[PDB]
């Protein structure tokens with residue numbers, strides 16, 4: 083059974099995925115309750131602190147026999163369900179979703195958060211409409227950013243191991259892992275197929291990724307612009323240092339689209355209509 | 365002033381280094397009280413759990429306006445004070461101390477603890493005698509060992525960044541950093557001078573270490589055995605994977621010394637004379 087405290091504020095209903103739809107008793111509004119059976123402390127700590135239109139918001143949390151997390155309900159489900167079994171997303175719909183994913187990831191990075199597990203199944207669509215707001219979820223694997231390397235470097239390396247000194251060159255580029263993921267997500271949305279797979283290949287999945295040699299099927303990509311493909315090429319770079327950042331991506335020719343930037347602002351203000359407190363008129 | 369609680373159990377006395385000698389009121393025995401002015405939680409968590417004759421033992425802790433740590437008093441001070449200003453340690457005294465440092469570090473590693481800051485100033489001598497017990501201190505920088513890489517690897521790397529997959533090869537060799545430090549400590553004890561320095565050199569300290577090209581002065585090392593030098597060569601290896609472990613070191617020809625292993629056991633049982641509860645005689 084569900085705990086008394088949760089039962090006191092919410093009316094539990096039909097399952098969504100475990101994730102279940104519930105009704106907030108006070109408001110009669112629908113909510114989503116993610117049950118994480120017995121690190122969730124860190125996920126809430128992050129989510130309570132985080133505030134962006136493209137990042138999921140915690141409404142409430144319950145620490146009982148299991149962990150119960152109350153989130154805003156996403157009527158469109160996962161982005162994964164839109165790309166399954168070679169279901170190709172329309173280029174405009176890709177731009178709109180990607181743009182949001184970039185803003186969302188940029189924000190995380192700004193605030194020292196590395197998602198670490200970005201995938202179509204962690205992106206949620208707000209409505210059943212293709213022109214809708216997306217939201218990033220699953221901060222389970224996320225990391226926070228002062229390095230113990232920095233504390234070490236203040237001292238004289240008389241006793242410091244070489245590898246620690248070598249690690250200095252690479253250091254501070256952990257966030258690049260999220261840009262790789264976005265690159266993989268963008269490839270999936272645009273083509274309908276993944277860039278790295280064990281399907282009809284001899285080469286190991288590890289090897290395709292390490293080499294950065296993605297599976298390019300021309301007939302598929304003929305339907306996709308050079309601008310879109312260029313951006314994928316720029317994010318799917320083996321060297322994290324050379325690999326494009328969210329800021330670099332957001333500045334890319336593909337995203338310099340005034341209609342998409344307009345549609346998102348229009349979707350944004352439409353969501354914010356109910357929340358709007360009267361304005362201080364000059 | 366010192367807190368009431370600490371004042372209640374201990375009589376504070378003359379400074380040792382901040383570290384001050386105190387007297388346990390119950391026992392009238394001398395103790396050392398390390399004052400760490402306002403991560404100490406982790407250092408105590410480790411030290412309370414740790415139990416070895418060559419690792420410092422916590423007796424008590426006080427969390428007031430500052431952090432007060434009660435430790436067993438080491439009458440011989442730091443190992444650093446024995447090697448300052450080209451003071452060369454006798455080879456036997458090196459073997460004896462090194463052997464203990466190896467046992468101590470091996471134990472840490474066994475229990476998943478990486479010291480991270482091993483240096484002559486973190487090694488304490490029990491008595492003013494050169495044949496004495498040593499103890500490892502300063503667990504401030506120490507790390508504990510399940511990897512978030514291991515949690516990642518359970519999944520399909522479809523979205524995994526290449527660098528994460530590359531990090532797999534190197535992974536699980538963080539403890540090698542302590543073997544480097546022991547190698548640097550052993551060089552210092554044996555020669556009287558450090559292997560890597562900015563004194564009478566053009567080459568950067570980073571560069572000497574990364575290259576692993578230690579400053580070898582033959583006239584100095586003529587007084588030192590080939591067995592001792594070989595061990596230093598084996599620990600001062602740039603590749604952590606190739607670099608000797610504490611077990612490899614403890615198996616080395618230099619440490620297969622029955623008199624040293626005997627002297628340490630004799631020093632050990634002499635310390636344990638006061639603690640000895642009667643034995644269950646068969």
Ligand SMILES: c1coc(-c2ccnc3[nH]nc(C4CC4)c23)c1
Pocket residue numbers: 098099101114116138153154155156157159160206219220
């Ligand atoms: C897991 C983590 O977050 C969710 C989730 C959060 C907020 N609204 C939602 N609508 N549908 C889902 C799940 C069924 C896709 C969710 C599930």
Ligand SMILES: c1coc(-c2ccnc3[nH]nc(C4CC4)c23)c1
Pocket residue numbers: 380381383396398420435436437438439441442488501502
């Ligand atoms: C700092 C960290 O530990 C100590 C310390 C711990 C136990 N006994 C000791 N005797 N002398 C010292 C200091 C003066 C060298 C210490 C100091």
